[PDB]
Amino acid sequence: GPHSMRYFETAVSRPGLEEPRYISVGYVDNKEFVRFDSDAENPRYEPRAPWMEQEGPEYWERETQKAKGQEQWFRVSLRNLLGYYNQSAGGSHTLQQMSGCDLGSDWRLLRGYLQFAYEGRDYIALNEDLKTWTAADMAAQITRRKWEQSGAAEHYKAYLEGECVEWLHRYLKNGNATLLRTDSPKAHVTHHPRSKGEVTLRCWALGFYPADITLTWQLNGEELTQDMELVETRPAGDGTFQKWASVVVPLGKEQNYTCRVYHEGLPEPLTLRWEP
Amino acid sequence: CSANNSHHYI
Amino acid sequence: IQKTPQIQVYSRHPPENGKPNILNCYVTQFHPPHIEIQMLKNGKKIPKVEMSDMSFSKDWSFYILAHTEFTPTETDTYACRVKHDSMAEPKTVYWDRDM
């Protein structure tokens, strides 16, 4: 399979003499392996995955100093954005960053990522070339012009192609099997008779990891999007997920309708019907 | 390995 | 704008009256990151409620899992009350064991 690393960073401000809160989360293959929160008694990068315990004290000291660097960078940028958007003082403002790299199954670099958002809206992004920026707003165009004069894209391209990739190789070796877990779903259909001669058939997938799953209902071979209801996939709290998808059907006809569960941990998709 | 945005501020 | 939070309330394990279980309240797609989440047994606040750390999605919106131990019964109601800047008044979502 492919592989990914991302750092999700957030700075949130508060009216007053107090400095914004800064939070940084690392992910390898979409799992959180490190975190830094400036609200902690002793702000530091800490391991969120067991294999990161292999890292030595020097690693943690270096990465913590970087985080305090980002913390300062974010407070400056927050102040400037208050200027750009002509916002007065005393609002709630959030600035966020996503950066990282996508590798293919050959562990070779597929894509670099850098993006920024202000108030939860796209602000500026590095293009997949890694030499140019898309700036959404008019305020962002100022930032773009300023970053073209400052050679920002060269800086981040060196990071995303070199260090991101090589450190991701290290973490991929060390988290080797752990990052590759899969837990197959367990599916079952529950029967909910309803007014006017019908029944709700609800199709459940439980205890699966990762969270990607697809559930389809099929009448006589055709997939049914008509009057099909579902919930967004939800964490159980144990490290697995849940989902259900339901279809309103005529009572007595249940065996005419079929649920199918598509998940990577399965040998083949699950096909199931309501069983009395 | 986390990011350094160095001197390029928004 | 602000984004209106989505709320699901559900048990970790299949509900069984009288059997101890875990109740979840999953709140997603809200911005700004500050939010208030309470879990209620019979309209009263449950004392010790565990809360996952601040995380956000590729669409920049934030999500949280709150959870607590509970034993479902026929007479007891459970719900999640959520206060956020995006909504005029607090929203309460009651647990439905079928969903």
Numbering used by the authors:
A (entry chain A): 1 to 276
B (entry chain P): 1 to 10
C (entry chain B): 1 to 99
Article passage:
Indeed, the decamer GP92 employs p5N and p10I as main anchor residues for binding to H-2Db. A small section of the C-terminal part of GP92, composed of residues p6S-p9Y, bulges out from the groove in order to accommodate the anchor residue p10I within the F-pocket. The other main anchor residue p5N forms two hydrogen bonds with the H-2Db residue Q97, and an additional hydrogen bond with the H-2Db residue Q70. The side chain of residue p10I fits well within the hydrophobic F-pocket of H-2Db composed by residues W73, L81, L95, F116, I124 and W147. Its main chain atoms also form an intricate network of hydrogen bonds with the H-2Db residues S77, N80, Y84, T143 and K146. All other peptide residues, except the bulging histidine residue p7H and non-anchoring residue p3A, form hydrogen bonds between their backbone atoms and the side chains of H-2Db residues. In GP92, residue p4N that can be glycosylated protrudes towards the solvent and is fully accessible to T cell receptors (TCRs). Thus, in line with the observations of Hudrisier et al, modifications targeting this residue should not significantly affect the binding capacity of the altered peptide(s) to H-2Db. Based on the crystal structure of H-2Db/GP92 solved in this study, we created molecular models of the different PTM versions of GP92 known to bind to H-2Db, indicating that both the glycan moiety at p4 and the modified residue p4D protrude from the cleft, and explaining the functionally observed efficient T cell triggering for all three GP92 peptide variants. In contrast to GP392, the GP92 epitope is not modified at position 5, but instead at position 4, causing peptide binding to be largely unaffected by glycosylation or de-glycosylation.
